[PDB]
Amino acid sequence: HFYAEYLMPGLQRLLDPESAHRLAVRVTSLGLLPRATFQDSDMLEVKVLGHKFRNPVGIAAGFDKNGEAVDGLYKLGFGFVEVGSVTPQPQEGNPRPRVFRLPEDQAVINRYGFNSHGLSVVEHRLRARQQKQAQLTADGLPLGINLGKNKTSEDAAADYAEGVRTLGPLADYLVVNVSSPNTQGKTELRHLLSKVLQERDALKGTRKPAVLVKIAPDLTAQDKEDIASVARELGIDGLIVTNTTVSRPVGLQGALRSETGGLSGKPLRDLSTQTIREMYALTQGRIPIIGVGGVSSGQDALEKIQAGASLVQLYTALIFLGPPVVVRVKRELEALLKERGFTTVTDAIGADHRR
Ligand SMILES: Cc1cc2nc3c(=O)[nH]c(=O)nc-3n(C[C@H](O)[C@H](O)[C@H](O)COP(=O)(O)O)c2cc1C
Ligand SMILES: Cc1cc(Nc2cc(F)c(C(F)(F)F)c(F)c2)n2nc(C(F)(F)F)nc2n1
Numbered sequence: 424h425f426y427a428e429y430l431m432p433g434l435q436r437l438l439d440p441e442s443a444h445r446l447a448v449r450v451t452s453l454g455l456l457p458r459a460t461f462q463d464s465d466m467l468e469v470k471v472l473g474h475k476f477r478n479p480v481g482i483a484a485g486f487d488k489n490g491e492a493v494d495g496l497y498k499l500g501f502g503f504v505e506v507g508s509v510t511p512q513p514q515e516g517n518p519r520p521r522v523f524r525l526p527e528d529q530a531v532i533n534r535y536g537f538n539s540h541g542l543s544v545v546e547h548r549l550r551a552r553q554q555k556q557a558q559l560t561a562d563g564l565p566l567g568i569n570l571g572k573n574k575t576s577e578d579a580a581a582d583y584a585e586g587v588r589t590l591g592p593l594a595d596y597l598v599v600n601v602s603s604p605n606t607q608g609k610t611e612l613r614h615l616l617s618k619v620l621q622e623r624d625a626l627k628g629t630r631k632p633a634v635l636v637k638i639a640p641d642l643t644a645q646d647k648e649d650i651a652s653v654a655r656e657l658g659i660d661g662l663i664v665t666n667t668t669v670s671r672p673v674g675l676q677g678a679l680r681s682e683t684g685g686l687s688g689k690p691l692r693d694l695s696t697q698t699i700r701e702m703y704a705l706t707q708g709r710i711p712i713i714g715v716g717g718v719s720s721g722q723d724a725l726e727k728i729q730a731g732a733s734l735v736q737l738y739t740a741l742i743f744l745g746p747p748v749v750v751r752v753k754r755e756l757e758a759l760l761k762e763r764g765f766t767t768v769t770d771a772i773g774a775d776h777r778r
């Protein structure tokens with residue numbers, strides 16, 4: 424409660440979004456935040472992507488862009504952390520201002536345009552902690568790395584390749600982020616993905632990261648069939664559904680609603696869940712999905728899980744509710760699984776399809 428209508432709305436008044444984000448990352452890294460004490464139950468454990476996840480709630484890409492706060496994030500209760508997106512070379516991103524809060528809608532619009540410290544900086548930081556991560560991973564706390572491309576780049580495959588070569592040895596999973604709204608066709612995707620998988624395969628007697636593709640919520644019905652077709656044809660390990668949306672739904676109260684960019688938070692929630700449900704159907708329940716978009720409660724997580732997600736992520740909820748939201752989600756999720764007749768979270772995955 425202290426976070427929810429004392430600290431967050433107040434920070435909102437005081438701090439511009441970028442300043443607030445930067446502060447959040449630093450406070451999280453430094454461990455100033457009180458630690459989560461909620462204990463995950465066996466009921467929340469998920470095994471997927473070649474790893475065990477102690478709980479199914481992860482932090483989505485975009486919070487820890489540069490891998491500065493990974494340990495602190497696990498301490499807040501996240502089951503898994505995704506770093507990035509990381510671009511090969513450092514870049515500024517778009518002109519400020521570039522992130523807008525719509526508190527009325529519990530939503531954010533962003534056009535960051537991939538401000539990243541770049542691969543070498545993030546490699547150095549992650550390497551220094553690689554041993555610690557190996558222990559965390561073993562304890563059910565995996566690490567994902569999300570790869571982006573520079574604004575310049577004509578050659579996407581080359582940018583992705585630097586990323587896979589550089590960070591793939593540090594990753595439990597890798598994500599190709601082809602969905603930023605702020606920076607194709609089957610064949611073109613197929614080529615790129617094959618090149619990425621080929622870079623992954625070449626890795627170094629690392630035993631090797633799973634490769635996922637992160638998609639937009641704004642796709643055509645054929646693209647969804649296409650993406651499913653490729654994933655199955657290429658043996659892509661997973662899908663992350665979804666990134667932010669370019670739409671503005673009816674009823675936004677926020678002044679900044681007209682701003683160009685990707686919308687996240689509650690207004691995205693149902694569109695994202697719908698997108699998961701299709702993808703599970705098209706892929707026959709055979710390809711794991713990490714569901715993201717507007718999760719801020721246990722029910723929100725459960726809906727995504729029932730729709731077909733094996734895991735879920737959140738980011739935007741933190742902006743409005745603070746760190747307690749991670750525990751709220753897990754606590755609510757456990758309570759709902761018990762009420763609703765599931766012995767474990769795993770039993771819920773794809774339940775919508777079952778009926
Ligand atoms: C400010 C901001 C920055 C983001 N940056 C990235 C990014 O760099 N890479 C990425 O894949 N997704 C990024 N995302 C998308 C989130 O990972 C997530 O897909 C989306 O926000 C939906 O989840 P949420 O509603 O819980 O925020 C960003 C989102 C926000 C709000
Ligand atoms: C008020 C506010 C908060 C914030 N994140 C945020 C999120 C947090 F969890 C904290 C902390 F440290 F209290 F737990 C915090 F200090 C800031 N963002 N992050 C954004 C941005 F830019 F990412 F959209 N705007 C924000 N506005």
Ligand SMILES: O=C(O)c1cc(=O)[nH]c(=O)[nH]1
Pocket residue numbers: 508533534535536537538600602603604605666667685
């Ligand atoms: O850097 C960004 O602007 C960004 C990337 C992304 O993948 N998603 C998003 O909403 N913003």
